[PDB]
Amino acid sequence: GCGELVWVGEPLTLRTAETITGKYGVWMRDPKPTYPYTQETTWRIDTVGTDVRQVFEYDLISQFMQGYPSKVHILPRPLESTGAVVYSGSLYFQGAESRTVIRYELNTETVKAEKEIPGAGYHGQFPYSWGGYTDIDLAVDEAGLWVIYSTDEARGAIVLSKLNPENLELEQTWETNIRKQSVANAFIICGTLYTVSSYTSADATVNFAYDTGTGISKTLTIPFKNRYKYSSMIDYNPLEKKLFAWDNLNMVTYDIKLS
Ligand SMILES: [Ca+2]
Ligand code: NA
């Protein structure tokens, strides 16, 4: 049930971090859950600091919203920024101070693949507008795994590549005309990249679209509210058909409508 994004709902706060370590972070669910996890399993990473390794795992939504983790994973290498995703049983994350994406299989706590994203800027070269070393943003949509980044050759414009989820090979690449540092974040729905204009405003917008199927770029004016005035992470979950975001300590979700 795909289409163009035409509306974003009000943010709903599901959990609030209680310490500075969670001012920024990433939380997610697996759109292709695999044993022993389910569509309720949630992962949370508080990403302030320089040695981020703890991944909080919750078996049930109730636990994510009110309790302690069911399990804590300690990653073998520190993680960079807020761009990570979970897909088909693995956490895909960027190694700190690198352009390396790592596939970490959660049930075995094993690194199964690593890949430098060719030519990608990293560690503050092509972040989103808030900074935060957000140079490399993973994404899952209806067709699988992607990565959003930029390169010198692209002159800082958003590049996105489809990824093989097993071995992290790049399968196809598209170049937009959207300056990555000029937008607050981005996500992919049904093969179209969308960007958000501001990470602080209550009256931000989803302001650009790039359709990988047609090559066409568009401007948009869909309202987008940053309720807590500092959104560090905005991703799309194609199973729930919702946006998942992190806004100034708060793990929030937005409903959407597609044409
Ligand atoms: Ca994103
Ligand atoms: Na991401």
111 CB contacts (<8 Å, ≥6 apart)?
A: 76, 102, 103, 104, 105
- For residue 92, CA distances in Å to 114, 135, 209, 214 come to 9, 15, 24, 28
Separation between Cα atoms, residue 135 and residue 9, nearest integer Å: 27
Q: Measure 234 CA to ligand 2 centroid, in angstroms.
A: 7
Going by C-beta distance under 8 Å and a sequence separation of 6 or more, which residues neighbour residue 167? 113, 115
121: domain range?
1-259
142/109 Cα distance (integer angstroms)? 26
Q: Cα–Cα distances in Å, from 50 out to 24, 53, 73, 132, 137?
A: 13, 9, 17, 11, 18
Determine the distance separating the centroid of ligand 1 and the alpha carbon of 233, expressed in angstroms: 6
Amino acid symbol at 151: T
AA identity, residue 199:
Y
Task: Using alpha carbons, list the distances in angstroms from residue 91 to 37, 84, 215.
Answer: 13, 7, 30
**Domains: count for the chain:** 1
Question: Residue 160's beta-bridge partner residues?
Answer: 148, 174
Instruction: Output the six-digit token pair for 176.
Output: 């937009």
- How many Å lie between the centroid of ligand 2 and the Cα of residue 19? 22
Distance of CA 178 from the midpoint of ligand 1 (Å) = 15
Closest ligand relative to 145 C-alpha: 2
CA distances from 55 to 78, 118, 124, 143, 229 (A): 11, 27, 23, 26, 25
Question: Please, where are the H alpha helices in 48-155?
Answer: 61-66
How much distance in Å is there from the Cα of 124 to the middle of ligand 1? 16
Q: What is the pairing mode between strands 137-141 and 242-247? A: unpaired
Q: Give the CA diameter of the chain.
A: 46
Type of residue at 256: I
CA distance 209 to 194: 5
Query: Is 45 annotated as belonging to a binding site?
Result: no
> Experimentally, how was this structure solved?
X-ray
Residues contacting 56, CB < 8 A, separation 6+: 43, 44, 45, 46, 69, 72
> CA–CA separation, 177 vs 198, rounded Å?
18
Nearest ligand for residue 139 CA: 2
